[PDB]
Design a binder for these strands. Structure first.
Ligand SMILES: Nc1ncnc2c1ncn2[C@@H]1O[C@H](COP(=O)(O)OP(=O)(O)OP(=O)(O)O)[C@@H](O)[C@H]1O
Length: 282
RNA sequence: UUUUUUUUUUUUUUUUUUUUUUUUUUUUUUUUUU
């Protein structure tokens, strides 16, 4: 059982498990609560491993069912166990990623049933983040399956984070990398300021951070409509000089070939293409 | 105003003909128009 901070390198354990299974000529099953992550992990594993066949089993697709490495959803595994598939006899490792996202009601019963129904020759690898309820999951699994499981945790984040506040064309650091609040900086922030964004607000930020070599930016707006307005407010700003635009255009043109000819003229596609040529997206 | 994609089961034909069942009897010479 591994419970480490985010961006600490949890995927190294899964890669080593897959390599061990390939060396022993056994099978591995990878499972995630969310179907969105399955495709991304499938692509990542296909790129990373060249001597190992990778498969995918979801409610929409089914690629290489006979491969030695399979990525599927929890309900797919539940149905497979209920049917009594013959490939389970060769499975050595089952990996559950993002365990801390399974504390829901619909996601909870299927996970417990899958854990209960698994045979005794299968070993477990568990990955998640730091959550208050960590020892209980491991204890329950080790009691139900009567197996030895080790709980491994990390002290702190390998990369540190800081919290700042922006006000009137400069940035005030108020929490440092040690998670210690700075009262004087907050007081100065209160003093210097003595509603919503304006039309000349996002340009005032896309230039200050650009000159500081901190360009890669993700802005969180809690509204579908406000994001489009904010993106449209950024006018006369570009990040592709002459070849990045051509490469992006080629990638977009090749990608949307799978659609029909009259389905590529939709306004959303045109607006996204126009925005993507300058390095801005929603 | 963020957040929400749900869809159950089955495999390759029973063996020996046509028959296919009820109310009681008689007597000695051609041809046409009559
Ligand atoms: N010991 C290490 N030293 C240097 N780099 C490392 C080390 N371990 C992992 N990395 C790098 O970390 C990068 C990404 O880390 P990773 O994706 O595993 O974080 P994570 O914990 O899985 O995030 P999440 O919470 O989303 O699951 C990898 O590309 C890897 O090169």
């Amino acid at each position: 059982f591994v419970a480490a901070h985010t961006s600490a390198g949890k995927t190294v354990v899964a890669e080593y498990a897959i390599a061990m299974a390939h060396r022993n000529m056994t099978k591995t099953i990878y499972t995630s609560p969310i179907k969105a992550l399955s495709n991304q992990k499938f692509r990542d594993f296909k790129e990373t491993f060249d001597d190992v066949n990778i498969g995918l089993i979801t409610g929409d697709v089914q690629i290489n069912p006979d491969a030695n490495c399979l990525i599927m959803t929890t309900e797919i595994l539940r149905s497979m166990l209920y049917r009594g598939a013959d490939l389970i006899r060769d499975v050595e490792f089952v990996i559950f990623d993002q365990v801390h996202y399974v504390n829901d009601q619909d996601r909870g019963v299927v996970w417990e049933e899958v854990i209960i129904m698994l045979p005794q020759h299968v070993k477990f690898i568990l990955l998640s983040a730091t959550v208050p309820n960590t020892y209980e999951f491991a204890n329950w699994i080790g009691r139900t399956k009567q197996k030895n499981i080790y709980v491994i945790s990390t002290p702190k984040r390998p990369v540190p984070l800081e919290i700042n506040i922006w006000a009137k064309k400069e940035l005030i650091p108020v929490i440092n990398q040690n998670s210690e609040f700075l009262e004087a900086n907050f007081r100065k922030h209160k003093e210097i300021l003595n509603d919503g964004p304006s039309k000349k607000t996002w340009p005032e930020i896309v230039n200050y951070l650009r000159k500081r070599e901190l360009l890669p930016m993700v802005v969180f707006v809690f509204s579908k409509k406000r994001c489009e307005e904010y993106a449209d407010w950024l006018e006369g700003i570009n990040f592709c000089n002459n070849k990045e635009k051509s490469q992006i255009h080629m990638f977009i043109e090749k990608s949307i070939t799978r659609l029909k000819k009259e389905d590529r003229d939709l306004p959303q596609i045109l607006k996204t293409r126009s925005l993507l040529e300058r390095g801005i997206a929603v």
